[PDB]
């Protein structure tokens, strides 16, 4: 059973036995589909649950099959799983062909109708719209170069650059106005992709390239689609420099895309040559510079699915070996995280394993012995190992290297800011990145501080959302007073330095200690001179706070007055609850936390009219198994844990608690043992997973809230 459909080599042997037991249950396989695929979260089925209609993602975006596979005709689990994979590949290829036709109709046009562009974008998935954009742009530039090849010929490359420019203006207009978040992500991926295409086209026009075989064009990745090819898998060929690969045609759901940094394209070139030379790459460098992320993005662009083995105490050996042999069978990629953190004997064992597999790969340039099994290594198999300065001696001669010492932060902060519809994106990026360089150094160091590149990306996202909310509010005001509404007119007269300052305030000022606040203000004065941001007080909420403090005997004050700082902290708590579904009120014991959140809950209930119900749970007092729930060794029955119990109670909405506001205050210390299962909620997924397989979605009213005294053992994740 294991050899056929090797995709469940990823899932555990006990989980394999679970799948064999639940073979006559398709509704219990969703966890396994989560495990073995990239972004697939569940297969869409009809009410009969006898034919699989399509697949979905964690984000809810779903793919419909051209020819659905009837499980009744193929009762064997492996047969219809293989049919599902083959049909998902075929459907992805056909949808890609359709979308590429649509865009090449859209391309080579003087102007783009926003309605048609938005319609096409909604028609296909994020990965497919980005890939069709890339195929169309590559074919256009190749055709322009072929026309230019006459020698000193006039340039239609100017025309291609103009087409990309007008499409970019279309996207910068569209992202500005309110959109569904999924289409927002599609637009962001498309705009960053097109910014990269514009910059490479500008490089081409500056270098005055004339020949389609000139190496300057050869270096940049080229996408060739061949619709005439009978095999749908090979129709797309992605080629960079000498190397050429086929598209994996595996579903990615929706993924965070990269800005395609000069360092990122350098890494793309080095890795692509390495796999062309039939050996993996080891992009070492300090942690947090996008090494793992760059490998993931490269695998995603190829259409292949990456396994990020995080190498820490949680790292295993038997599970790693089985998922490794599965990697070898299927052909998916595998990117180890920090390797120097492994145990020395652990390190030697995995090093010998990957050395054997790599020798098999160079032999294929064909089976190798894994767990006493000969495994036909797929030629598409790739292994990457990031490091934090080295590579074991048995691997130095098998793997290339690269120093991702410093990703270009200015380019990232400019591309992402432009992706949020910001005008003057370059100025704002060149201001914000040195500011975050200042923050990581001049500020007093703390454990909870994080001025990494990811924090910068999050601040940019928050600023984009703030700008959207401001334009929505101004549109409402203009509708009330007058009727002259024009999105571009509002945007032009909309300051953006103030927006960035407000975003950085709302995200970073709360994390500051009582001394770093003047330092942050001085840094804002230095980098963004003359521009200041004053948070608009919530006067109704301030009055509710005063009344609640009177009712609770607590003290109240405004700013300088006694209790002013506590009041400000309560207001920041409210803002974070507005903009985040997960919170942590860090502070030394007896600082403000319990009283602050209680007072805010009561004032909110007395203001908005929504009842406030809190489930104060101490995580350490109860055992971890009892916190989330116990597993029956025989019947697998779910004795839902305390947190699982309260979440299920709120979900069932027996007494209208969905209308009520629910705060799950996790008073107590925090460690990376229980919070590992709760990390699946604090992300944008906002869903809880359980070891039986049933998954519960967090209702919007539920606010997960951690009242902790200190973060010496809180994971930065």
Partner 1 sequence: LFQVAFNRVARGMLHQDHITFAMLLARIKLKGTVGEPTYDAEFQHFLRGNEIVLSAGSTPRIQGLTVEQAEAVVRLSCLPAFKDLIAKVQADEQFGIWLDSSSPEQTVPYLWSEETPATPIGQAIHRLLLIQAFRPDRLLAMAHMFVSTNLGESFMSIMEQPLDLTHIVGTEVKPNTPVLMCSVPGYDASGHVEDLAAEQNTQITSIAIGSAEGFNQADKAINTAVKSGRWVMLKNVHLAPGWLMQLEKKLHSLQPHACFRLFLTMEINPKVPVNLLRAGRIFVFEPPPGVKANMLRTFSSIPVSRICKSPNERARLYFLLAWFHAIIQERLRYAPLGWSKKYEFGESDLRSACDTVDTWLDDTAKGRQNISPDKIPWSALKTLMAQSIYGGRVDNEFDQRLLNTFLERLFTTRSFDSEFKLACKVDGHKDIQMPDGIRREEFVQWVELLPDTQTPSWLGLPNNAERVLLTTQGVDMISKMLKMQPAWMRTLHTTASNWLHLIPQTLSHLKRTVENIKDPLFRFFEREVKMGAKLLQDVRQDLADVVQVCEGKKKQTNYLRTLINELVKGILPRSWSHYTVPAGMTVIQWVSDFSERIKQLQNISLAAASGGAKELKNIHVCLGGLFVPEAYITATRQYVAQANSWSLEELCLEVNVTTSQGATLDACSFGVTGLKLQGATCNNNKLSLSNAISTALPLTQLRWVKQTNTEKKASVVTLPVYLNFTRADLIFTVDFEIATKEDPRSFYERGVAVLCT
Partner 2 sequence: DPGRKPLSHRFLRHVPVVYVDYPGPASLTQIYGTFNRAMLRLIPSLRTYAEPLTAAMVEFYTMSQERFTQDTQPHYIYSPREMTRWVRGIFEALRPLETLPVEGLIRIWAHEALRLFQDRLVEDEERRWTDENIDTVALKHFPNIDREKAMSRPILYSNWLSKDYIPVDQEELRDYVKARLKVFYEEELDVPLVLFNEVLDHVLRIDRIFRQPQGHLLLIGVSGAGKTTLSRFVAWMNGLSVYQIKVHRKYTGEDFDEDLRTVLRRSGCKNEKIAFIMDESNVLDSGFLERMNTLLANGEVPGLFEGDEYATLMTQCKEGAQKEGLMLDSHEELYKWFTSQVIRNLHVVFTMNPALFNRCVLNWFGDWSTEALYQVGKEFTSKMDLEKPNYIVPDYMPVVYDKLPQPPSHREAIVNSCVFVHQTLHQANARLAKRGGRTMAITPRHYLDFINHYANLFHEKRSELEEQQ
Ligand X SMILES: Nc1ncnc2c1ncn2[C@@H]1O[C@H](COP(=O)(O)OP(=O)(O)O)[C@@H](O)[C@H]1O
Q: List residues near ligand ATP by CB under 6 A.
A: 554-555, 563, 566, 589-595, 667, 707, 709
Give the nearest distance from C-beta 557 to partner 2 in angstroms: 24
CB 129 within 8 A of CB 230: no
Residue 527 near partner 1 by CB under 8 A:
yes
Of 196 and 569, CB closest to ligand ATP: 569
Residue 554 contact among ligand X, ligand ATP, partner 2, none, beta carbon within 5 to 8 Å by kind: ligand ATP
How far apart CA 29 and CA 33 sit, in angstroms, is 6
How many chain residues touch partner 2 (CB under 8 A)? 5
Judging by DSSP bridges, how do beta strands 222-225 and 236-240 pair with one another? antiparallel
Q: Which string of x and - marks every residue 351-370 that binds partner 1 (by CB under 8 A)? A: -x--xx--------------
Q: Which two tokens stand for residue 713?
A: 């053992």
Residue 8 vs 399, nearer CB to partner 1 = 399
The answer on whether 57 is annotated among ligand-binding residues is: no
For 117, residues 6+ apart whose C-beta sits below 8 A from its C-beta are: 106, 167, 170, 174
Q: Which of residues 429-448 bind partner 1 (CB under 8 A)?
A: 430-431, 434-435, 438, 441-442
Q: Which is nearer to partner 2, 78 or 709 (CB)?
A: 709
- Report d(CA 558, CA 554) in Å as an integer: 14
In whole angstroms, how far apart are CA 418 and each of 156, 301, 674? Answer: 27, 22, 39
Please report, for residues 53, 168, 395, 401, the alpha-carbon distance to residue 404 in angstroms, rounded to integers and kept in the order given: 43, 30, 19, 10
Per partner kind, with CB cut-offs from 5 to 8 A, the member of partner 1, ligand X, partner 2, none near residue 580 is none
Q: Is 321 annotated as a binding residue?
A: no
Output the smallest distance, CB 620 to partner 2, in A. 10
Q: How many whole angstroms separate alpha carbon 388 and alpha carbon 286?
A: 5
The two tokens of residue 52 are 């699989």
Q: Distance from CA of residue 175 to its chain's centroid?
A: 19
239 sits near partner 1 (criterion: CB under 8 A): no
> Has 334 been labeled as part of a binding site?
no
Segment lying near ligand X (by CB under 6 A), choices 1-9, 19-27, 95-103, 289-297: 289-297
The three state secondary structure string of 397-450 is CCCEEEECCCCCHHHHHHHHHHHCCCCCHHHHHHHHHHHHHHHHHHCCCCCCCC
Check binding of 553 to partner 1 (CB under 8 A): no
Residue selected from 380, 487, 709, 711 as contacting partner 2 according to rule CB under 8 A: 709
Q: Is 137 exposed, middle or buried (0-12, 13-18, 19+ CB in 10 A)?
A: buried
Q: Which of residues 448-507 bind ligand X (CB under 6 A)?
A: 453-454, 457
| Vertex 110 angle, CA 104 and 112, to 5° | 65
191-207 core/surface letters (b: 16 or more CB in 10 A; e: else): bbbbbbbbebbeebeee
Q: Do residues 88 and 251 touch, judged by C-beta distance below 8 A?
A: yes
- Contact pattern from residue 627 through residue 666 relative to partner 2, giving x for each residue in contact according to CB under 8 A and a dash for the rest: ----------------------------------------
A 10 A CB-CB count for 281 gives 25
Which residue lies nearer to ligand X by CB, 399 or 566? 399
Partner that binds at residue 216, options partner 2, partner 1, ligand ATP, none, CB closer than 5 to 8 Å by kind: partner 1
Q: 3-class secondary structure for 596-612?
A: HHHHHHHHHHHHHCCCE
Distance (Å, whole) CA 433 – CA 408: 10
Chain centroid to CA 556: how far? 41
Instruction: Please report, as residue ranges, which positions from 363 to 402 form the binding site for ligand X (by CB under 6 A).
Output: 386
Annotated binding residue 514: no
Residue 290 contact among ligand X, partner 1, partner 2, none, beta carbon within 5 to 8 Å by kind: ligand X
Toward partner 1, which CB reaches closer, 317 or 713? 317
Query: Would you say 340 or 709 has its CB closer to partner 2?
Result: 709
Phi, psi for 343 (deg, rounded to 5): -70, 145
| Contact with ligand X (CB under 6 A) among 264, 353, 462, 503 | 264
Closest to 207 in 3D by CA, of 163, 155, 244: 155
| Closest residue by beta carbon to ligand ATP | 594
By the rule CB under 8 A, 669 interacts with partner 2? yes
Q: Is 503 annotated as a binding residue?
A: no
> Interface with partner 1 by CB under 8 A: which residues?
215-216, 218-219, 241-242, 266, 269-270, 273-274, 277, 285, 352, 355-356, 393-394, 396-397, 400-403, 405, 430-431, 434-435, 438, 441-442, 518-519, 522, 525-530
Binding-site positions for ATP read 285-292, 587-594
Binding-site positions read 285-292, 587-594
> Interface with partner 2 by CB under 8 A: which residues?
588-590, 669, 709
């Amino acid at each position: 059973e294991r050899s056929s459909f090797p995709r469940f080599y990823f899932v555990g042997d006990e989980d394999l036995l679970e799948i064999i037991g639940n073979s006559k249950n398709v509704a219990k396989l969703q966890k396994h589909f989560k495990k073995m695929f990239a972004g697939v979260s569940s297969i869409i089925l009809n009410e009969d649950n006898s034919v699989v209609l399509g697949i979905s993602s964690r984000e809810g975006e779903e793919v419909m099959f051209k020819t659905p596979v009837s499980i009744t005709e193929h009762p064997k689990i492996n047969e219809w799983l293989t049919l599902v994979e083959k049909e998902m590949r075929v459907t992805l290829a056909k949808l890609l062909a359709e979308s590429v036709t649509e865009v090449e109709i859209f391309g080579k046009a003087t102007s783009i109708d926003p309605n048609t562009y938005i319609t096409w974008i909604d028609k296909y998935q994020a990965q497919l719209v980005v890939l069709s954009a890339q195929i169309a742009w590559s074919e256009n530039v190749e055709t322009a170069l072929s026309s230019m090849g006459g020698g000193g010929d006039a340039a239609p490359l100017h025309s291609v650059l103009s087409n990309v420019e007008v499409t970019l203006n279309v996207l910068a207009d569209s992202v500005l106005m309110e959109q569904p978040p999924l289409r927002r992500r599609k637009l962001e991926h498309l705009i960053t992709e097109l910014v990269h295409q514009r910059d490479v086209t500008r490089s081409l026009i500056k270098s005055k390239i004339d020949n389609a075989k000139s190496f300057e064009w050869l270096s940049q990745m080229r996408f060739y689609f061949d619709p005439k090819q009978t095999d749908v898998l090979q129709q797309l060929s992605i080629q960079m420099a000498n190397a050429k690969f086929n598209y994996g045609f595996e579903y990615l759901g929706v993924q965070d895309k990269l800005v395609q940094t000069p360092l990122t394209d350098r890494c793309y070139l080095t890795m692509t040559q390495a796999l062309e030379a039939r050996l993996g790459g080891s992009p070492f460098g300090p942690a947090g510079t996008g090494k793992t992320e760059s490998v993931k993005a490269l695998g995603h662009q190829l259409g292949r699915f990456v396994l990020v083995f995080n190498c820490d105490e949680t790292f295993d050996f038997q599970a790693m070996g089985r998922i490794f042999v599965g990697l070898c069978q299927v052909g998916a990629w595998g990117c180890f995280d920090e390797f120097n953190r492994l145990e020395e004997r652990m390190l030697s064992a995995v090093s010998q394993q990957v050395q054997c597999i790599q020798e098999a790969l160079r032999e294929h340039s064909i089976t190798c012995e894994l767990l006493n099994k000969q495994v036909k290594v797929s030629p598409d198999m790739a292994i990457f190992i990031t490091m934090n300065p080295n590579l074991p001696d048995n691997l130095k001669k098998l793997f290339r290297s690269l120093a991702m010492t410093k990703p270009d932060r200015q380019l990232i902060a400019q591309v992402m800011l432009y992706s949020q519809g910001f005008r003057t994106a370059e100025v704002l990026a060149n201001k914000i990145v040195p500011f975050f360089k200042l923050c990581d150094e001049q500020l007093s160091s703390q454990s909870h501080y994080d001025f990494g590149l990811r924090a910068l990306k999050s601040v940019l996202v928050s600023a984009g959302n703030v700008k959207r909310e401001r334009i929505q509010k101004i549109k409402r005001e203009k509708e009330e007073r007058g009727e002259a509404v024009d999105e571009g007119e509002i945007a032009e007269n909309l300051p953006e330095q103030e927006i960035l300052i407000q975003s950085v305030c709302e995200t970073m000022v709360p994390k500051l200690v009582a001394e770093d606040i003047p330092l942050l203000f001085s840094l804002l004065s230095d980098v963004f001179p003359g521009v200041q941001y004053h948070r608009g007080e919530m006067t109704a909420l301030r009055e509710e706070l005063k009344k609640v403090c009177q009712e609770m005997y607590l003290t109240y004050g405004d700013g300088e007055e006694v209790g002013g700082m506590w009041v400000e902290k309560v207001l920041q708590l409210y803002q974070i609850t507005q903009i985040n579904h997960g919170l942590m009120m860090v502070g030394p014991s007896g600082s403000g936390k319990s009283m602050a959140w209680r007072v805010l809950l009561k004032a909110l209930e007395r203001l908005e009219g929504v009842e406030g119900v809190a489930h104060i749970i101490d995580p350490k007092a109860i055992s971890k198994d009892h916190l989330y729930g116990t597993l029956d060794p025989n019947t697998r029955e779910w004795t839902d844990g305390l947190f699982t119990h309260v979440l299920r109670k709120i979900i069932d909405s027996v007494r209208g608690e969905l209308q009520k506001r629910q705060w799950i205050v996790f008073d107590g210390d925090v460690d990376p043992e229980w919070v590992e299962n709760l990390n699946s909620v604090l992300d944008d997924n906002k869903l809880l997973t359980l070891p039986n397989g049933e998954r519960l979605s967090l209702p919007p009213n539920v606010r997960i809230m951690f009242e902790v005294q200190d973060l010496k053992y809180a994971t930065l994740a």
